[PDB]
A = this chain, B = another copy of it.
Amino acid sequence: RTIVVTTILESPYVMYKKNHEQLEGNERYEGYCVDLAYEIAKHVRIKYKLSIVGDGKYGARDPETKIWNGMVGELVYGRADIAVAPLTITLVREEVIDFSKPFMSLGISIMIKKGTPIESAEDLAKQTEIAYGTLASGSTKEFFRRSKIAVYEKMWSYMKSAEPSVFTKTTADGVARVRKSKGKFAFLLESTMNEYIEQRKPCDTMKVGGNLDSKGYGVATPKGSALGNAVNLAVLKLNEQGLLDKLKNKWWYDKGEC
């Protein structure tokens, strides 16, 4: 009866409240996805418990052991009933879990330290003074790994072999590295996170260029789960009432610091 909602600590989707160490259960967290889980549960009519994913990952399949990790894994092996998180809808994931229709649209983008002389992936690709990388595992990394498009192949060729590693274990790590690199590191990440970060102090980063692709985040459910249908209707409803747009303004722009 109390359903497990797997999620992931990633601002501003899910965040520790300032006095969290003194709080319990759901009250520990706030963010866009905390609000969204609340709204969804209200329409689906369920009680639920947020659970930050143990391995801190999104979800990829180990090519060796065939095993799925991250939030995906939590749904594939039955430890969670639903994932409300910035989980990217992809072909490989969609073969093993279900996704609602997108609650947010987005694409991969480039984050630079202000002043950095880079406007496009082409600008990054044709040079080697400025390093660049992506979250160590996630759909962004995969986009590069799988692309057949020359510029992206070049970038992947460089990233996969660069030393030290240019991959990071979290978004926050990538951002820190951009901020600390005096313009000598650019980070490849989703436009959503990129835009959030751009609106926060010290206001020293910016998104440059267009997005590289066009995709979305879906609320995810175990394959053939009988919550799937309701959750999907619930998402469309919420989008149609303009609630999704309201929550986006609330967590990104309303409090923007820049």
> Interface on A for B, CB 8 Å cutoff?
89-91, 94-95, 99, 101-102, 105, 143, 146-149, 213-216, 218, 232-233, 236-237, 239-242, 244-245
Q: How far is the CA of A149 from the CA of B246 in the complex (A)?
A: 11
* 8 interchain residue pairs of minimum CB distance: A91-B236, A105-B105, A91-B237, A91-B240, A105-B214, A94-B236, A149-B242, A89-B101
Contact (A232, B101) CB under 8 Å given A146-B240, A214-B245, A215-B239: no
A interface, over-half SS: mixed
- Asked if A236 and B105 make an inter-chain contact with CB atoms under 8 angstroms apart, the answer reads no
- With A90-B236, A146-B240 known, 5 other A-B pairs at CB within 8 A are A90-B240, A94-B233, A101-B216, A147-B242, A214-B245
- The residue in chain B whose Cβ has the minimal distance to the Cβ of A248 is B214
Contact (A216, B102) CB under 8 Å given A90-B240, A91-B236, A233-B94: yes
